[PDB]
Structures are given as structure tokens and as C-alpha cells.
Point group: D4
Chain length 164, copies 8
């Protein structure tokens, strides 16, 4: 009954946001994903946010590049947590997207993650952490993911030792 | 029955945008000005834009700082030209507001001007230049405004010679 | 039972973070606040975070400037949501703080807000939004808070009309 | 009524072709020239003053690095001037952007986005300005946005099939 | 037709900074002209003066501008005399825009850019002197003793530093 | 006596091999581990405190993006800590450089250049510190500089021919 | 006769380097300080470096603003560790000084610290940490110094508690 | 015997400075080029600069990337005009090289050109404009170069007209 909603401004963002899809799947957390633009389809974007909110959406994830307005538009229309992911495309290396996502005025928060794929994964994990506050099974899965990454780094470290 | 509409997100933007008021008055161009936030009063912002557009608004001017989403929001709900002025408040000196204003994705333009007072003034004049395409009295006034400023500069240059 | 934990590396951060204290009180959300440095008192910081987590802390908020490592250190030791507020001090306008806070590698997310006082206010509101997923009383207070700020801006707008 | 497009180098043609396409698709007539503010200052000014008098409604200028072209145009006309920052060089076109937008009060340039996004938006902005007195172009501007929304709807529909 | 330096600035607010140049020139004995001339507000007048000064014997042009600094670029576009550009520091970006807008000239039309602000103003004046000193022996000797003098200054300040240790 | 090199990820090995090579060539012993400040905080701290007690003279840390590794090391030791910012990411390692060098007064981290030059310099700087107590190493540092001077003098003579 | 040599290019840097003199005083490390410019007094700058190197200088500390070249010039003439402190004066907040100091090419290292007073204090402590490798009496002071700052922070946290 | 001296830190910089050799050759201006590092071969660099100065070098050109100190070291040892060219190599796009080259303290000027190839050509041209003050031959060559490039752009504009 709980789910995450992922919106992206362009279908070219799908390359980066697959990381998020993968992450949510791996945790057993249902999500919906749509191509919705604050600039080109403002009415539909707003409609979906209000409908998703009403249908039980726990967290929104928004991905946009350049002058990224998507996250702020969502935040303005719901009081559910909103996570903003700055895309890396364009000549400024996503710096425009980052500043445009994170510098919100007092009153209307957006949670901003790292630029690019790292941010897409972190968006998914953050949503999971928020959800785990009420879902102990998700909380358990988060613990074991960190345990498995540590085993992974240990292996990498043991391999390094042979090469020196 | 042709006018310029100026929106700002914050009462504190008035310090800068008064420069714009003074400009349009001195060109005898009528305008409406409102405090409307893309983030705090989104529905009201949208209603006004659609309502002003229908009543003969020729050009929209929008001022905002930090993550400036106002001009982008306006541009998305109208095909009248939208001019964006980045505010200078904040520790990044308005670099965030500039990048967030000008970096619009192809298909939905915003005309961005300089940061702060320079931009406010330039926004008013850009608007006048646009209206001048159809109002010859306006064009006449813009020409004499440029002549008057040349005299002023020569005045200052003559003054400098005595100081040497 | 549920509370927010605010940490800051320095007492100079209090000027900014009072804004967060104020928002949380207004929403009736219990919080704890401490001076704890990731650099100067790492052991105490880690002991606090782990214990606070165990005691029912739902959200950690961290304030740091310059090379801001505090949020990174908290997130490394808890699976509870962690929000980082970049401080605006130093000759770089807090840009170092922002990049150091937001650019976390995939796997250990930190929710970054705006720089300075706007970010402190938003940290508090985002924390409230997260807690409001499981608390109707808080959900309702966030609604009325946004309603009240809309009324305040409407008033400011009507006020402006007479000043034109 | 026409739009005049200037660029200071034909390396700028890659980008500015996007603008040509937009104007063509909207049926808006244009002239385009290679004219440098740095290399051909007199010819640049001559053209501007000549184009202006023949009914140029909007100037579009494309320049990179230290982009001075738009500013040079705006100094010599009261027609709207749109500046498009080229993305080339090692600074991601940030130099060009600041060079274009940071005009002093009195002589405005309308700055668009860096690169092709900016080339497309300059064409569309010039069209929005001209549409203030042209039903035909206003109507074309509407249907263009309508078509784009259809494009995004289909993209969304395709995504759902894969989810 | 005497050798002088021409100083242009787009605004009377640039003067507080460019005074430093006047002083440096005044002290090396290099004659100069100075004018408020704007590439944006008075383009015709700016070009007219540049071509006029060039042919009248101007050896070096110094131009000061802030924000989107187009003045040095404009001058260089109309003369083959060396153009020195000094970016002004005002505005919210700390003169970064002025700097990039001054230095990033395409190949073929050079502008010698100096430091932002008063440091730049002084160095422009000294640089103009160094250019002039290839043909003028007295200037060259004045420039040398200038360096002898400051090495003194610093050497003094150094011994002061030792008294406070 | 030895140098300890830590890095958050295997992908940093690209750059840090450069450090290994310089140390080998100077005959300075070192240990290297993959240890993350974010992913394995306990093990990172446990290792620093251990190496510290077994006579580690200098720590070298490599991290990209939001680099907290060097800072975590310096917080737990009073041995000299050197930070090397990686160039990876869309920001050119600017995030990494500011995140490494801008430490609070009291807990220093010696920052070197971004990328492979910084990796080389971390190794040489460690060697310079150790050479304060070990003359064989000092002599080696001097001979290395003499050699590169030869290389450069050689390259100059070749250029004289290309001219 | 282990001592630390501090160089600065202008007396205007004394505002800043006082911090380091003190740190070095507290820890009882002998030092020398000079006004010596890489640009203005290059011959004297080189004489002093080689001389002091030969007299047993263990570490050089150099401070410079804007285009900071002093540290690079010192490193070119000795094999002793050289620490660079970037000054924060100027409209670019010492960003020019930072890049100018830290971006040394492979082969000739400079240990760069933070901008301004933070860096100045850190340079002293880093000098101390290098020297302590061969003087446990300094090593001992450095440890007690951290203990003291921790007590300072604890007291500051205690004061915070009373006001909450 | 008026000549121009070009110094460069690394042979990796030849790629870029060829452009300068070519410009100078085409103008018939005699030049010398040397690999000389301010960091790796300081004594020899200084030896060359003072030697060439006394031999009648009129202008120095210096090329360097990263923390570019070469131009500044030459300037410290001569009163001849020194022209600095920032190399584009490295992850910072040559911004580190630019700031390190142009931000000279008042008293010791360096004339900085643009980053990379453009800068290399402009250094040669600037050197020629300086020399042209005392050599009408070079002056006239400069004039015809400018006339020739206009013909090129004209030809390119005519090509453009065929494509429309």
C-alpha cells in the first residue's frame, strides 16, 4: 500500500534513473515511474502529484538536468517528502542542476542528492530509509545491504594485497 | 490596454524591482505588479498568468533569488515573452539564481538579464523594446532615453578632464 | 519516543540553527541538540549517533561549514535519514560546504538542503514531513502552516497594490 | 518582418542550425551571416544598422569564449537582441554565458541557455515576440507545444510497457 | 605625435580604482589621456577616440570595465596598438565575469589582461611603462629604481617584523 | 617505519599506483588498503589506530567527490596526513579538493594536487618528511631531482633541432 | 637546532600569520619569520631558503595571496617539506590563492592547507606533527592539546543544554 | 638584434606553442624557444632570462599549466614585458592556470592571454604589436594579416549564403 513515485523531465533521464529502479526492486519497494515535465506538461505533472499523494505515495523522487525545476514543482504541491536528483548532462557538469535543485527558500524543502547515477542510487536508498521507519522488513534489508558491501570491500582489499 | 506584468516571489525583492517600476513609468508603459511565489502560491501564480495573458499582457517580468523557479513557471503557462531577473541576495551572490533562470531546456525560452538592479532595469527596457515594435511613441522615447544618457556620460567625461 | 537530533560542529553554527529550533518548537516536535565535531570529538559523535538511534531518533540533522564532514559521519553510522545543512561562513560563500555535503557516493545518502538559514528552516520542515508519514497530528500542522503563509503573502500582495 | 542571425565563426554553425530549423518550421523568414565583433567590426555595425532599417524585428547573436557579439549589436539598435552562449572551449561555456548576460543597466541583451538548447530557445523567443502582432505565428506556437505534449505522453506510455 | 598612454573606462565609478593607474603613470613621468567612454552606451564616440588617439601617437591603451567587460575587446578590434584590460571587482561575482570576459579573446585580437582591481590598475600602468621603456631610456631607469625602492620598503618592514618577535 | 595509503574504492587504484611506484623507487616501505570512511567506518578507524602504533610515519588518503577519508584519518591520529583529491566526476575534482583542504583549525590535512600529479607528490612529500631522519632517502630525493634536470636539458636540446 | 621557517610576501599577511606564531609558541617550537617576496625580492628569498635549509630548518611555511608563488619557489630550492597557506584577501576569496598553491606538478610537492587563519593554524600544527616524528615531547603536547579542545567543546555543549 | 624569447615548462606544451612559432615566423620575427621549468630547473631559468635580457630580448612569452609559476618567475627577474599563456591541460579546464597567471600583485605585471591555442597565437601577436611600435615593417605585416582574415570570414559568409 506504500509506494515511491519517480518523475523525470525527459525520457533521456531514464538512462540514469534505471539505477533507482534497480535499487527499489532489490529492496522489494513498489514504485511508479512517469515521464513528466514541469516545463512542457505542467498541468499533467501537478495532477499526477496530487493523485499519487492521495493514493498513498510516501516519497517523491524527481530527476532533472540544466535548470531543474521538477523537484520544486512537486514540493510546492504536496507535503510528502521530495527527493531531487540533479542530472549530469550539459556542459556545466550538472552544477546548474545541483544549484537549481538544492537552493530552495525557507518553507518548501527538497532533499537533494549527488549529481548523476550516484545520486539516483542514493535517492532510492533515502526513500527506503524514510520508509523503513514504519516497515521493519525494509529496515532489515537496509542493514544487510551495508553488510554485503563491507564483505565486498574486504574482498577487494584482500585482492589488492596480492598485487603489492 | 497593452501592459507589462511583474511578479516577484518575495516582498524583499521589491528593493531591487523598484528599479523596474521607475523604468516603465518613465517610458509611460503601464504595468501590474504582484507578490506571487512559484513555490508557496503556485495555484495563484498560475491563475494570474493565464488571466493577465488573456487581458492583453504583452510581456511578463519575473524576479527571484536562490533556486529561481518563477520565470520558468510563468513561461510554462503562456506563450507571451518572459523575462527573468536573477536576484543577488544569498551567499553565492546570485550565481544560483542566474543558472536556475537561464538554463531552460529547448522549447520553453526565458529571456534572462543581469543579476540585481542592472537586470531589473534591463528587463524593463527589454520589455519596452518589445512593445516598441508595435508602439511608435514607445520607440521614440527609447531613442531619446539613449540620447539623454550619452549627454550624461559626456557630462561626466568633461568633468574628469578638470580633475587631471 | 520519536525525536529529531541536531548536531553541529561548532558553537558558531548556533546563529544559523536557531531557525531550526524555532520551526520544530512551532510544530510541537521534540528535539535534542548538541555540539559534536566529526573532527575534534569523533568518538563522542559516533557514540551519540548510535545511542540516539537506539533511543528513537527518527531523523538526524547536521550543520557544518567549510569542509563539512559531519553529515557524512552520521550517515556512516545509522540507517536513519540524515539531513545536512551547509553553513555559509568562510570566504567561499558556503560552496565548499555544499559540495562536501551533497556529493556522497552511492550507498550512503545524505539529504542536502540550501545553504544557511533557509537550509536550517527546511531541514526542520523536511524532518517534520518525514515524521508526518506516521503522525497525523504533525501532518495537519504542516498543512495549516502552509495555509497561514499563503494568507501572509496574500496580505503582502494587497499591501503592495496600494504602494503602486 | 524578419529575424537576423549573426555568428562570429562558422564553427558556430553546428549549433545555430538548430535555430534555422525552428524558424523554418514556424514559417518565420531570416537572414544569417558570419560577422565577427572582433574581426569585422565595421561590417558588423553596417549590417545591423542596415537590417534594422529594412525591418529586422529581432537580432540573434551566437558567440563563445569572450562573447561580445550580442553586446556590440545591442549598442547599435533598439530592436530586441537575443544572445546565445556557445558551449565550446575548456570552461563549458560559462565564460560565454557571463559575457552575455551580465550587461550593464541601459543596454539589455536577452540571454538564452548555453548551446543548442539556447539556439532553439532563441528562435522560439524571437517567434514569441513577433507573434505579438501575428495571429498565424501565435497559433503555430500553440500547436507546437501541443505536439510536444503528445510526444511526452507517448514516451510515458512506452515506459509503462517496460515497467 | 608624442608618446602617451590612453586610459578608457565605461563609468565614473571605475575611477576610484583607476586613480591607482593615474598615480603610477604620474610617478614614472609618462603622459596620459583618460576618458569615460562606454563600448555599450557610446560606441561611436569610443571608436572615434580610439582611432584618433592611435594616429596621434598613442603607444598603449588601458581599458577598465566590470561585469560583462566589452571595452578592451572593442578597442583592440580597432587598433594594432597593445591593449591592456583591467577587470573591475564590483558586482556579486567578485570580478570573475569581468576577468573571463576580458581575457578569453579569440586568436587574432589579443588583449593583455591584468589582475582584478587595484592590483590590476597598477600593473597595467607599469606594463605600459615597460612597453614604452624599450624605446625610452629614462623610463627604463625609473622602472629599475622603482624596484630598488620597494625592495627597501619590504626590507624595512622585515626588520620591523623582527622587533615584534 | 612505513607509509600507509588508504583509498575508499578500487577505482582509485588507477591514480594511486602512481604513488606505489614512487615509493618503491625510493625504497620506502608502505602498506595500502581499500578502506572507506563511509562504507567501512569501523575498520578504517581500527586500521589507522593500529598502523599508528606499529610505527606508521605518514598516512596518504585518496578520495573523490565528497572526500571525507583524509579528514577521518586526521581525526584519529597525530601523524602527518596527506590528502589526494581524485579528478573523477562531472565537477573535475573541485568538490574533492575543497572537501579535502578546507579543514577546521586544529586538525590539519596536507592537500596535494588533483589526480596523478598529486599522487606522485603525496609519495614524494612523505619521502621528504621521512628523509628528515633517514639520510639514504634524502640522498635519493636529491638524485631524482638531478635526473629530471637531465631529462629536461636533453629535451631542450632536441627542441633546438626541431626549430 | 630543529626550527621552522615562515615566509610571507607582504606585511598585510601578518593579520593572518599571527595565528601560527602563537600555535608555534604554545607548543614551544622555535621559528623564524620574514617578509620575503617571490616576486619582489626573489634573490633574497632564495638565499634565505638554502641557508636556513643548511642550518637545519625542518619545515618551511609560506603564506601568499592572489597568485601565490612563494611556496612553489621555496619548494624548487629545498627538499624540506614546504607548507603553503593561501591568504583570503581579494574579491575571489582566495580561490585564486588556493589553486595557485596546491596545483603543483608531479615532482615538486607543496603541502597546502585551508584558506586564511584556519590554514595558518593548521600549518603550524602540521609542522609540529612532522617534527614530533623525532621529538615525543612535542608529540605529548599535541596530544594534550587535543584533549583540551575536547574539554572546550564539552563545556560549550553543556552551555547549550542549559538554554534548550 | 630584437628577438622574442619563448619559455615552456614541459615538452607537453609544445603541441600548443607551435601556434606561436608559426605566427612569429609568418611575421618574420626572430625568436628563441626553450624548455625551462620554474619548478624543476629554476637556476637555469633565471640564468637564461637575465642572459637573454642583456642580449636584447624585447619580450618574453611563458607557457604553463596547473599552478603556472613560470611567467611570474621571469617577470621577477626582468623589466621587459612578459606575456603569460595558461595551458588547458588538467581537470579544471585551465582555470587554475589562468588565475595563477593573471592574479599578480601590484608592482610586478604579467600580461595574460586566453587559455590554450587562442592564447598562444595572441601572445605572439601581442609580442609583435609591442615590437611594431619601433618597426614599421612588422606594423604593416600586422595590418595585412587582419585584412586577410576578413577576406576569409567574407568567403565563409558567402559559402553560408549558398547553403540557405
Amino acid at each position: 500500500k506504500i509506494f515511491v513515485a519517480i518523475l523525470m523531465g525527459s525520457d533521456s533521464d531514464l538512462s540514469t534513473m534505471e539505477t533507482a529502479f534497480t535499487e527499489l526492486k532489490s529492496l522489494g519497494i513498489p514504485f511508479e515511474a512517469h515521464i513528466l515535465s514541469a516545463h512542457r506538461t505542467p498541468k499533467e505533472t501537478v495532477e499526477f502529484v496530487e493523485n499519487a499523494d492521495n493514493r498513498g505515495c510516501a516519497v517523491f523522487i524527481a530527476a532533472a538536468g540544466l535548470a531543474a525545476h521538477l523537484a520544486g514543482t512537486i514540493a510546492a504541491h504536496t507535503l510528502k517528502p521530495v527527493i531531487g536528483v540533479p542530472m549530469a548532462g550539459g556542459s556545466l557538469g550538472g552544477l546548474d542542476a545541483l544549484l537549481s535543485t538544492v537552493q530552495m527558500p525557507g518553507g518548501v524543502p527538497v532533499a537533494c542528492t549527488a549529481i548523476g547515477k550516484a545520486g539516483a542510487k542514493n535517492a532510492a536508498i533515502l526513500a527506503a530509509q524514510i520508509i523503513a521507519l514504519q516497515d521493519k522488513s525494509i529496515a532489515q534489508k537496509l542493514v544487510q545491504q551495508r553488510t554485503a558491501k563491507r564483505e565486498t570491500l574486504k574482498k577487494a582489499d584482500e585482492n589488492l594485497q596480492t598485487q603489492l
